Design an enzyme around this catalytic site. Structure first.
Site, mmCIF file in Angstrom:
data_model
loop_
_atom_site.group_PDB
_atom_site.id
_atom_site.type_symbol
_atom_site.label_atom_id
_atom_site.label_comp_id
_atom_site.label_asym_id
_atom_site.label_seq_id
_atom_site.Cartn_x
_atom_site.Cartn_y
_atom_site.Cartn_z
ATOM 1 N N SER A 1 -1.020 -0.873 -6.190
ATOM 2 C CA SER A 1 -0.671 -1.795 -7.251
ATOM 3 C C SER A 1 -0.017 -1.212 -8.493
ATOM 4 C CB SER A 1 -1.910 -2.557 -7.669
ATOM 5 O OG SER A 1 -2.514 -3.112 -6.521
ATOM 6 N N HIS B 1 0.789 -1.216 0.000
ATOM 7 C CA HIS B 1 0.000 0.000 0.000
ATOM 8 C C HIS B 1 0.824 1.270 0.000
ATOM 9 C CE1 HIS B 1 -3.670 -2.401 1.679
ATOM 10 N NE2 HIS B 1 -3.299 -2.782 0.473
ATOM 11 N N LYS C 1 -14.863 -8.101 -8.856
ATOM 12 C CA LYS C 1 -13.988 -8.842 -9.746
ATOM 13 C C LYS C 1 -13.325 -9.998 -8.983
ATOM 14 C CE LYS C 1 -10.590 -8.284 -13.351
ATOM 15 N NZ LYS C 1 -9.780 -7.378 -14.183
ATOM 16 N N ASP C 2 -12.925 -9.732 -7.738
ATOM 17 C CA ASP C 2 -12.276 -10.751 -6.914
ATOM 18 C C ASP C 2 -13.193 -11.914 -6.554
ATOM 19 O OD1 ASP C 2 -9.640 -9.050 -4.932
ATOM 20 O OD2 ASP C 2 -9.829 -9.510 -7.080
ATOM 21 N N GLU D 1 5.361 -34.358 -4.225
ATOM 22 C CA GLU D 1 4.137 -33.745 -4.670
ATOM 23 C C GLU D 1 4.465 -32.897 -5.904
ATOM 24 O OE1 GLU D 1 0.723 -34.062 -2.948
ATOM 25 O OE2 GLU D 1 1.990 -35.857 -2.955
HETATM 26 C C1 HEM Z 1 0.969 -16.417 1.195
HETATM 27 C C2 HEM Z 1 1.415 -15.774 -0.131
HETATM 28 C C3 HEM Z 1 0.953 -14.589 -0.652
HETATM 29 C C4 HEM Z 1 -0.212 -13.875 -0.429
HETATM 30 C C5 HEM Z 1 -1.355 -14.227 0.478
HETATM 31 C C6 HEM Z 1 -0.122 -12.672 -1.258
HETATM 32 C C7 HEM Z 1 -1.101 -11.706 -1.291
HETATM 33 C C8 HEM Z 1 -0.995 -10.531 -2.090
HETATM 34 C C9 HEM Z 1 -2.081 -9.615 -2.302
HETATM 35 C C10 HEM Z 1 -3.486 -9.763 -1.751
HETATM 36 C C11 HEM Z 1 -1.662 -8.768 -3.287
HETATM 37 C C12 HEM Z 1 -2.521 -7.703 -3.980
HETATM 38 C C13 HEM Z 1 -3.305 -8.150 -5.211
HETATM 39 C C14 HEM Z 1 -2.420 -8.685 -6.342
HETATM 40 O O1 HEM Z 1 -1.755 -7.872 -7.032
HETATM 41 O O2 HEM Z 1 -2.388 -9.922 -6.536
HETATM 42 C C15 HEM Z 1 -0.277 -9.096 -3.572
HETATM 43 C C16 HEM Z 1 0.525 -8.424 -4.446
HETATM 44 C C17 HEM Z 1 1.862 -8.707 -4.692
HETATM 45 N N1 HEM Z 1 2.516 -9.777 -4.108
HETATM 46 FE FE1 HEM Z 1 1.794 -11.197 -3.019
HETATM 47 N N2 HEM Z 1 1.101 -12.605 -1.975
HETATM 48 C C18 HEM Z 1 1.712 -13.805 -1.668
HETATM 49 C C19 HEM Z 1 2.943 -14.226 -2.137
HETATM 50 C C20 HEM Z 1 3.775 -13.493 -2.920
HETATM 51 C C21 HEM Z 1 4.976 -13.978 -3.533
HETATM 52 C C22 HEM Z 1 5.446 -15.396 -3.405
HETATM 53 C C23 HEM Z 1 5.528 -12.936 -4.212
HETATM 54 C C24 HEM Z 1 6.756 -12.821 -4.874
HETATM 55 C C25 HEM Z 1 7.850 -13.866 -4.775
HETATM 56 C C26 HEM Z 1 4.586 -11.850 -4.038
HETATM 57 C C27 HEM Z 1 4.748 -10.625 -4.553
HETATM 58 C C28 HEM Z 1 3.786 -9.651 -4.603
HETATM 59 C C29 HEM Z 1 4.006 -8.397 -5.353
HETATM 60 C C30 HEM Z 1 5.340 -7.853 -5.861
HETATM 61 C C31 HEM Z 1 2.792 -7.803 -5.499
HETATM 62 C C32 HEM Z 1 2.585 -6.534 -6.346
HETATM 63 C C33 HEM Z 1 1.505 -6.686 -7.394
HETATM 64 C C34 HEM Z 1 1.499 -5.575 -8.452
HETATM 65 O O3 HEM Z 1 2.304 -5.655 -9.415
HETATM 66 O O4 HEM Z 1 0.687 -4.622 -8.324
HETATM 67 N N3 HEM Z 1 3.471 -12.216 -3.333
HETATM 68 N N4 HEM Z 1 0.122 -10.206 -2.901
HETATM 69 C C1 LIG Z 2 4.874 -31.929 0.174
HETATM 70 C C2 LIG Z 2 6.368 -32.238 0.271
HETATM 71 C C3 LIG Z 2 7.247 -30.974 0.170
HETATM 72 C C4 LIG Z 2 6.720 -29.701 0.340
HETATM 73 C C5 LIG Z 2 7.562 -28.566 0.275
HETATM 74 C C6 LIG Z 2 8.928 -28.716 0.046
HETATM 75 O O1 LIG Z 2 9.741 -27.623 0.001
HETATM 76 C C7 LIG Z 2 10.675 -27.604 1.004
HETATM 77 C C8 LIG Z 2 10.320 -27.397 2.338
HETATM 78 C C9 LIG Z 2 11.280 -27.378 3.338
HETATM 79 C C10 LIG Z 2 12.615 -27.565 3.021
HETATM 80 C C11 LIG Z 2 12.984 -27.770 1.700
HETATM 81 C C12 LIG Z 2 12.023 -27.788 0.703
HETATM 82 C C13 LIG Z 2 9.435 -30.002 -0.129
HETATM 83 C C14 LIG Z 2 8.606 -31.108 -0.067
HETATM 84 O O2 LIG Z 2 6.667 -32.856 1.562
HETATM 85 C C15 LIG Z 2 7.134 -34.096 1.331
HETATM 86 O O3 LIG Z 2 7.473 -34.868 2.220
HETATM 87 N N1 LIG Z 2 7.178 -34.379 0.008
HETATM 88 N N2 LIG Z 2 7.618 -35.613 -0.540
HETATM 89 C C16 LIG Z 2 8.922 -35.843 -0.989
HETATM 90 C C17 LIG Z 2 9.198 -37.033 -1.696
HETATM 91 C C18 LIG Z 2 10.497 -37.296 -2.168
HETATM 92 C C19 LIG Z 2 11.527 -36.373 -1.934
HETATM 93 C C20 LIG Z 2 11.259 -35.178 -1.224
HETATM 94 C C21 LIG Z 2 9.963 -34.910 -0.753
HETATM 95 C C22 LIG Z 2 6.743 -33.340 -0.722
HETATM 96 O O4 LIG Z 2 6.669 -33.305 -1.911
#
Ligand code: HEM
Ligand SMILES: C[C@@]1(c2ccc(Oc3ccccc3)cc2)OC(=O)N(Nc2ccccc2)C1=O
Ligand SMILES: CCCCCCCC/C=C\CCCCCCCC(=O)OC[C@H](COP(=O)(O)OCCN)OC(=O)CCCCCCC/C=C\CCCCCCCC
Ligand SMILES: CCCCCCCC/C=C\CCCCCCCC(=O)OC[C@H](COP(=O)(O)OCCN)OC(=O)CCCCCCC/C=C\CCCCCCCC
Ligand code: HEM
Ligand SMILES: CCCCCCCCO[C@@H]1O[C@H](CO)[C@@H](O)[C@H](O)[C@H]1O
Ligand SMILES: CCCCCCCCO[C@@H]1O[C@H](CO)[C@@H](O)[C@H](O)[C@H]1O
Lengths: 49, 422, 442, 101, 108, 59, 271
Positions: G97, G93, G119-120, G163
């Site tokens: 965005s 914020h 939309k969401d 997985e």
């Molecule tokens: C538990 C995981 C996550 C949740 C609940 C989450 C939630 C949100 C929400 C609600 C928004 C605003 C709406 C949208 O633009 O989608 C947002 C935006 C964003 N999130 Fe996440 N996010 C998550 C993981 C991540 C990850 C893994 C990345 C990057 C490695 C990330 C990067 C960003 C960025 C950079 C924005 C900016 C969007 C734009 O370009 O306007 N988020 N996220």
């Molecule tokens: C779901 C899963 C999983 C989820 C997230 C992961 O990501 C990581 C989490 C912690 C540390 C490293 C990686 C890795 C495996 O947990 C699990 O036991 N497995 N099974 C698995 C089978 C063979 C080799 C390695 C893993 C997953 O896929």
């Protein structure tokens, strides 16, 4: 007017070494701080432990 | 191992005047004197000269705003700009070994300004500030109104940009002002703590904005108006004047002497001024704190002469009238021959002291080196001053009592008299 | 070149009239000159009963002597185009005259007559008593000065430097013709005075008129004895005078300084040069070399700020002062303290190179005219017991480097307990403890 | 010969911001330098840029583009900000170089 | 903003609640239980997790898993004591916090 | 002048203050544990396995 | 938007840990052995490796104390995810965005409600269909039948396969036939995300007007598919080589091609 303003007397609170108005207070500064900081450094040691 | 020196003064073919002087001082103070000012503004570009004064730090074709400030500070130097309704001076001070450095900047600022639109827009709000601090002295406000009452044009123009124009001045106006006024024949490159050959060299090989007399200012027309600013202050400042003498006008010294004869400022700390006809007179009239002085200004094509007072509101009436009688009483031969002798000393003294400081010496040199590419010996100036009869003075005094007067006053004017009651 | 000009400056001549007085002067070829007597007296020499005496005297020192009453005294000076000014401070007083070199001798006579035979007109005293009371009300509106008074009032609480120069309302309302008289006799004494002059004057002609009007010689050794004043204890503390009705706020923070004779002062002045000063009319604006100045412009932290290294015989105040809107005090103090920390910790060679040049041209500027040069002479003999050339100063300044600035600054600033004075709408200024913490790390 | 010119013209067209009526300069990421340069743009150039952008965002939300006849042409693209931006960067580097002792 | 303690979106929050936060100059010891309650909470959670990592929620194994914790887990007994007594400390502090509230009319 | 010496060398610079706390803790721990254990065992002479052990030790 | 991004990566990492400890709870064969393979990854860390693993296990192998501590972790972490989400949206914020054209949208903003709330909610029901369809008509499409068999410490399944969402990473882990080397490749395969903000050379924010980057982008996506597929196959020709290729190009696209092409594109624009 501000000319009639003077800092009260803090003798009932001053540390012994800065009680005398005609003595440099710098000469006892390091000791006054060394002590207070020593307490703090010690508390930090007891805490870390 | 250095000694004495000559006050050289070349004058290139294009009209540019060059006056130098080696005093072997560890500090040099160069400056670019110019015949410019609010005097040359017209309704359309009012205040443009004020803003130009503040624009000294803006970027140029040779140096950026950033380098101008950093560069000059790099070598403990300074850069400032002073100006009157009719002249602008750009001077720089620094230690001898840096004159070359500091010079590049002085040059660029006066001849190669870029007045970038954005830099200018950003700077204009400064006019408000600059002006607000200036106006803290009531002195400044009444003198502004004074010239506005004294003239109908040119010199009537205020020295500080009027409010309705803060923000409206344009880069084009700044450029056209510089182009039509900063011409080689209206400029002078004066310097102290330098060698003529050096300064002379800088001028010719670097100064390019060229020749001409540029746009000439309109003649100063006398109005003899009266402006009163009712603002409620406990103190009332008032000034009454009459067209005085012009610069170089023979009749100048007469007023100068009459000025010192009437009272031209204190000489003793907290001390009374006995040698002051005017002060002593007002003192006899009022019991309360006050201040009275002989006012006097000399411009190229005109001048103003009179008195300036400052008094409690309730006693303004008597204080101003008292000051008037001192002028009549003087116009009626009430001037001793010894009075004229004493005043001539204070005048010779003052002048002589004025040149003690680098700022004063340089200003004296350049001022004259600009309005006549010459330099009067401090003996000829003294020779000219004392050679002023007691008659002359009394005449000056008469010219005042008979001439049409203009007045300006500010404060709780409830007891301040109108010009037609004096 | 620069150097050469420093060496070719006429030397300052000094001579002592065995009665205790010192006569010094610098010769030039100027038809005009300044001469006066610099006395080693001031409010610090006063006490609880006669505080404001030296000031009360400063008011009469020009209202006439015995040989010549008021009107006569003024007329004579006025009619010769001479200027009579002077001042009284905490450790130094002065009475000087600007006039034509051609009158150096008559002036010296006039000076001597002022310091020795002040009429102290009984009626004038009651008259000046009311004038002084008005000047105290005028100055009470000068925040900057109210603030520096308060800075001394707390920085040196309990001692003599805590008192103001002008004195108390009670003292001014009850100072006696005898008290002023006593003050003059007690303090305006030959061994504690300096006859200084600059311009187009003969040192010998100066010393001659000096012998003629400053004649009274001393017999005992105690008459050639300049009393050493008792130490003034510094105290890390604060005084907060709050009035939200005031438009801006003034703040002054300082640590104890070394005192005149200490060489470190050259370094502190360089340091102060790095931080410099500023006010809303410095065209330089956001490009100013002073980092604090830059930030001030960028963040609109203040209306103005200034550093200072006020010296005295045995102590001093090294600090800074600023004026800011009630809502930007905290950030300003934050940056100001931040810059002090940088001084002690990360000063650069470039920073000092600049500060040094700035300092040189600053010292050269304090010698711009006969009065300022004369003031240097008076002050120099009175504080260093000798004149210090611009060449010596430049010599000392030239030796300063980044490392030196850090050590010296770390010496007087780092982890010290400051003295604080705040006046006006100061609610945003955080407590002493918070400020005290701004004294270390950064 | 005219290779670079050929390539640039192909890219311009391939990029496609011209289908939204945007000039190349309208598409720059607003980092510090760009933000500063924008503040120096003359009123009209600025208001024009703003309309082009708002208009493009409207097209973007609508999932439409402009009619082929309104697409900006490679040789008619006006580099209105580039000159300003270059001065801005030029100044920044000067400060930077200068502040390094 | 010139200093991070105020501009940063996260520190800004710490600064406005634990550094520059304006507090009355005269609050007494009765105003200490708010922070103590906070620490009990952090303490309880931390010891609870540590216990939960050896606990077994099943009527046939609950009692003994706790026994297993106190008897076999390094400092298990200590962690259990701290948790069990911490709960009391929590109530002592909440009651005093409440008392202070009623007395000083903090409930307004 | 220990307080004075300590202040300059240890407490002035924040860096040195930190090293002083680290070593201080190291020293304190070693000493505090030993002293504490001693005081405890002394108040329980003859009751600990440390005290009894020799009777059945026969490895 | 660096802070929003970085916390975003923390969120990913935390979600991974969560899914992992959670997957182990049912305690089937796959739960057990996956727990064995994953935890033993840490033993690759030099010096402290063996020590950390046995510590994490609470014993000499994955066993009951591992299970009970994993449950607690699985219970806890989701809440750290929730909390860090607040930090994520908080940093976001600060700027609001970004948008598909990558140019300021200050000239055209709209209230979140009802535009995006509606939309969401729509997007919610659109994704909710496949989810429910899968869960209600094909509950076991994504799981390993091996997890319907109680964990057996003495018998390891013939084909231990993770997985689907961990396959691409697993693929990378196996590309490097060296224990520690493979672990680092795995770590880097995810932590590479912290580096993205510094590999941006384009004068334009998005890839909307950058055709060369768009290709490079889909190559990367397809590269991920390949890795995913490779991670589900046995370590044998041609998989082994195909795998190392995909692994190598994954890092090459992110560390070299993207910044390189970005620069190249700037020039084609005459910047
Ligand atoms: C538990 C995981 C996550 C949740 C609940 C989450 C939630 C949100 C929400 C609600 C928004 C605003 C709406 C949208 O633009 O989608 C947002 C935006 C964003 N999130 Fe996440 N996010 C998550 C993981 C991540 C990850 C893994 C990345 C990057 C490695 C990330 C990067 C960003 C960025 C950079 C924005 C900016 C969007 C734009 O370009 O306007 N988020 N996220
Ligand atoms: C779901 C899963 C999983 C989820 C997230 C992961 O990501 C990581 C989490 C912690 C540390 C490293 C990686 C890795 C495996 O947990 C699990 O036991 N497995 N099974 C698995 C089978 C063979 C080799 C390695 C893993 C997953 O896929
Ligand atoms: C053997 C054991 C090995 C120990 C390893 C741990 C290493 C820890 C060392 C870290 C370095 C610490 C130094 C901090 C420096 C910062 C500082 O200024 O001091 C702290 C500063 C003091 O300020 P000044 O007096 O102005 O000092 C200025 C001098 N220049 O603030 C403090 O007072 C903090 C110290 C008090 C600690 C409070 C804790 C008390 C609570 C008790 C509960 C017990 C602990 C149980 C922990 C359970 C948690 C799971
Ligand atoms: C990681 C684990 C990998 C697991 C497998 C990956 C899943 C693969 C399934 C495919 C996903 C469907 C994507 C198809 C979208 C097709 C499409 O519309 O592409 C073109 C379209 C054109 O858009 P504009 O340039 O704005 O133009 C509009 C008008 N000017 O581009 C887009 O939609 C934008 C791209 C966003 C989708 C990215 C999703 C891909 C997912 C994989 C993970 C990759 C990232 C990890 C990096 C390390
Ligand atoms: C508000 C903080 C908490 C309070 C007031 C609290 C209170 C208690 C109480 C009354 C007991 C019984 C102690 C006994 O055995 O006599 C208990 C047991 C337990 N608590 Fe908590 N608890 C808190 C937080 C937590 C948390 C956050 C967890 C775990 C993540 C937790 C896990 C446990 C476990 C596993 C036990 C069982 C072992 C035992 O009985 O010692 N607790 N708690
Ligand atoms: C770090 C300790 C936090 C204690 C919690 C206090 C609550 O909540 C408030 O929200 C505002 C807007 O986001 C912030 O600006 C404030 O600083 C914050 O205290
Ligand atoms: C209801 C959940 C809303 C998302 C949390 C955003 C809170 C941080 O947002 C800030 O305060 C603005």
């Amino acid at each position: 007017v501000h000319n009639d303003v003077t800092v009260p007397d803090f003798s009932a609170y001053r540390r012994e070494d800065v009680m005398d108005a005609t003595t440099s207070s710098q000469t006892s500064s390091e000791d006054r701080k060394g002590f207070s900081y020593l307490v703090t450094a010690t508390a930090c040691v007891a805490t870390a432990y | 191992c250095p000694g004495a020196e000559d006050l050289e003064i070349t004058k290139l073919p294009n009209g540019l005047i060059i006056a130098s002087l080696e005093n072997f001082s560890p500090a040099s103070r160069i400056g670019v004197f110019i015949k410019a000012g609010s005097r040359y503004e017209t309704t359309a570009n009012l205040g443009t000269a004020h803003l130009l004064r503040l624009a000294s730090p803006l970027t140029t074709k040779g140096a950026s705003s950033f380098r101008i400030t950093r560069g000059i500070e790099a070598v403990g130097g300074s850069l400032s700009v002073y100006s009157t309704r009719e002249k602008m001076t750009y001077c720089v001070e620094c230690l001898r070994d840096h004159v070359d450095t500091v010079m590049e900047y002085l040059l660029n600022v006066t001849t190669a300004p870029e007045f970038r639109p954005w830099e200018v827009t950003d700077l204009q709000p400064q006019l408000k500030v600059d002006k607000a601090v200036a106006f803290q002295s009531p002195q400044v406000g009444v003198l502004e109104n004074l010239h506005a009452a004294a003239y109908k044009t040119a010199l009537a123009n205020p020295l500080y940009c009027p409010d309705y124009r803060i923000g409206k001045i344009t880069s084009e106006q700044l450029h056209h002002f510089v182009q039509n006024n900063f011409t080689s024949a209206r400029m002078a490159l004066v310097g102290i703590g330098v060698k003529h050959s050096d300064l002379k060299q800088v001028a010719e090989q670097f100064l390019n904005i060229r020749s001409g007399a540029g746009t000439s200012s309109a003649k100063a027309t006398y109005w003899g108006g009266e402006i009163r600013e009712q603002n409620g202050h406990s103190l009332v400042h008032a000034a009454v004047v009459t067209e005085g003498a012009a610069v170089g006008s023979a009749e100048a010294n007469a007023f100068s002497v009459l000025q010192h004869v009437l009272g031209a400022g204190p000489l003793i700390k907290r001390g009374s001024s006995v040698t002051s006809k005017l002060y002593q007179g007002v003192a006899k009239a009022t019991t309360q704190p006050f201040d009275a002085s002989a006012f006097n200004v000399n411009y190229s094509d005109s001048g103003l002469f009179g008195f300036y007072t400052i008094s409690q509101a309730a006693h303004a009436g008597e204080v101003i009238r008292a000051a008037m009688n001192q002028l009549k009483a003087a116009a009626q031969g009430g001037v001793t021959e010894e009075d004229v002798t004493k005043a001539k000393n204070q005048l010779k003294a003052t002048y002589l002291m004025s040149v003690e400081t680098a700022q004063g010496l340089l200003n004296e040199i350049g001022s004259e080196a600009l309005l006549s590419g010459t330099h009067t010996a401090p003996s000829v100036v003294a020779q000219k001053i004392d050679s002023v009869t007691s008659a002359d003075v009394v005449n000056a005094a008469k010219k005042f009592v008979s001439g049409k007067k203009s007045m300006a006053a500010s404060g709780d004017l409830g007891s301040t008299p109108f010009l037609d009651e004096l | 070149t620069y150097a050469q000009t420093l060496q070719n400056i006429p030397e300052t001549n000094v001579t002592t009239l065995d009665n205790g007085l010192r006569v010094a002067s610098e010769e030039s070829s100027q038809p005009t000159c300044t001469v006066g007597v610099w006395i080693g007296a001031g409010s610090r020499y006063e006490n609880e009963k006669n505080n404001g005496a030296g000031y009360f005297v400063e008011h009469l020192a020009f209202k006439g002597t015995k040989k010549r009453p008021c009107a006569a005294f003024e007329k004579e000076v006025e009619s010769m185009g001479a200027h009579f000014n002077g001042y009284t401070s905490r450790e130094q007083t002065a009475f000087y005259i600007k006039a034509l070199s051609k009158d150096m001798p008559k002036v010296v006579e006039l000076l001597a007559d002022v310091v020795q035979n002040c009429a102290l007109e009984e009626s004038q005293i009651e008259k000046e008593r009311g004038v002084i009371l008005q000047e105290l009300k005028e100055m009470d509106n000068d925040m900057t000065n109210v603030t520096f008074d308060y800075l001394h009032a707390t920085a040196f609480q309990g001692t003599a430097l805590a008192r103001t120069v002008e004195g108390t309302t009670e003292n001014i309302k009850h100072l006696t013709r005898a008290d002023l008289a006593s003050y003059i006799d007690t303090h305006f004494k030959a061994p504690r005075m300096v006859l200084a002059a600059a311009g187009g004057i003969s040192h010998k002609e100066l010393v001659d008129a000096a012998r003629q009007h400053f004649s009274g010689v001393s017999f005992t050794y105690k008459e050639d004895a300049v009393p050493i004043l008792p130490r003034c204890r510094f105290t890390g503390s604060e005084i907060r005078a709050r009035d939200d009705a005031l438009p801006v706020a003034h703040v002054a923070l300082a640590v104890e300084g070394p005192g005149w004779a200490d060489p470190d002062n050259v370094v502190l002045h360089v340091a102060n040069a790095i931080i410099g000063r500023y006010d809303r009319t410095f065209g330089g604006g956001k490009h100013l070399s002073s980092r604090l100045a830059a930030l001030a412009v960028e963040h609109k932290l203040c209306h103005s700020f200034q550093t200072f290294n006020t010296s005295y015989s045995d102590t001093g105040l090294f600090g800074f002062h600023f004026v800011a809107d009630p809502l930007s005090i905290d950030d300003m103090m934050f940056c100001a303290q931040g810059e002090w920390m940088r001084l002690c910790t990360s000063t650069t060679e470039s920073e000092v190179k600049r500060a040094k040049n700035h300092l040189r041209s600053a010292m050269v500027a304090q010698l711009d005219g006969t009065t300022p040069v004369c003031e240097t002479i008076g002050s120099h003999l009175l504080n260093y017991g000798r004149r210090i050339s611009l060449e010596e100063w430049d010599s000392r300044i030239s030796a300063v480097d980044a490392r030196m600035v850090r050590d010296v600054c770390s010496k007087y600033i780092y982890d010290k307990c400051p003295a604080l004075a705040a006046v006006g709408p100061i609610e945003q200024l955080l407590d002493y403890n918070r400020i005290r913490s701004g004294m270390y790390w950064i | 010969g005219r290779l670079m010119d050929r390539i640039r013209k192909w890219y311009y067209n391939a990029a496609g911001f011209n289908k939204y009526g945007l000039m190349r300069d309208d598409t720059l990421y607003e980092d510090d330098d760009v933000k500063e340069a924008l503040k120096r743009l003359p009123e009209d150039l600025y208001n024009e840029r703003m309309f082009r952008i708002k208009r493009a965002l409207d097209l973007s939300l609508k999932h439409r583009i402009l009619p082929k006849e309104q697409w900006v042409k490679y040789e008619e693209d006006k580099p209105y900000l580039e000159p300003y931006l270059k001065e801005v960067i030029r100044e920044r580097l000067e400060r930077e170089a200068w502040n390094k002792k | 903003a010139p200093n991070i303690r105020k501009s940063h979106p996260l520190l800004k929050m710490i600064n406005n609640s634990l550094i520059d936060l304006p507090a009355p100059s005269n609050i007494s010891a009765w105003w200490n239980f708010g922070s103590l309650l906070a620490v009990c909470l952090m303490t309880q959670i931390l010891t609870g997790l540590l216990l939960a990592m050896h606990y077994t929620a099943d009527t046939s194994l609950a009692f003994s898993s706790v026994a297993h914790t106190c008897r076999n887990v390094q400092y298990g007994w200590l962690i259990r004591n701290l948790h069990a007594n911490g709960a009391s400390f929590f109530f002592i502090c909440i009651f005093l916090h409440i008392g202070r509230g009623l007395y000083y009319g903090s409930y307004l | 002048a220990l307080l004075r010496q300590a202040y300059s060398a240890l407490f002035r610079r924040t860096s040195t203050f930190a090293l002083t706390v680290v070593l201080g803790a190291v020293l304190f721990e070693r000493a505090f544990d030993q002293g504490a254990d001693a005081i405890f065992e002394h108040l329980n002479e003859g009751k600990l396995w440390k005290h009894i052990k020799h009777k059945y030790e026969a490895s | 938007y660096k802070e929003t991004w970085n916390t975003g990566v923390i969120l990913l990492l935390t979600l991974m840990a969560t899914a992992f400890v959670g997957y182990v709870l049912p305690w089937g064969q796959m739960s057990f052995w996956g727990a064995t393979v994953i935890t033993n990854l840490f033993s690759a860390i030099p010096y402290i490796g063996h020590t950390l693993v046995e510590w994490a296990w609470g014993g000499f192998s994955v066993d009951n104390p591992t299970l009970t501590r994993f449950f607690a972790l699985h219970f806890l972490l989701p809440f750290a995810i929730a909390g860090i989400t607040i930090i994520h949206l908080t940093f976001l914020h600060e700027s609001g965005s970004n948008n598909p054209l990558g140019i300021s949208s200050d000239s055209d903003k709209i209230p979140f409600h009802p535009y995006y709330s509606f939309k969401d909610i729509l997007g919610l029901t659109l994704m909710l269909t496949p989810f429910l369809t899968l869960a209600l008509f094909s509950p076991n499409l994504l799981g390993d039948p091996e997890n319907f068999t109680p964990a057996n410490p003495l018998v390891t399944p013939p084909h231990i396969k993770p997985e689907w969402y961990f396959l691409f990473a697993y693929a990378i882990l196996r590309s490097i036939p060296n224990k520690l080397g493979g672990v680092l490749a795995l770590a880097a395969s995810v932590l590479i995300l912290f580096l993205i903000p510094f590999l941006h050379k384009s004068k334009q924010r998005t890839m909307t007007f950058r055709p060369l980057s768009q290709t490079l982008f889909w190559l990367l996506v397809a590269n991920l598919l390949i890795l995913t597929w490779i991670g589900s196959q046995p370590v044998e020709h041609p998989f082994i080589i195909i795998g190392q290729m995909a692994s190598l190009s994954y890092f090459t696209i992110l560390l070299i091609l993207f910044p390189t092409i970005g620069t190249l594109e700037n020039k084609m624009l005459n910047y």
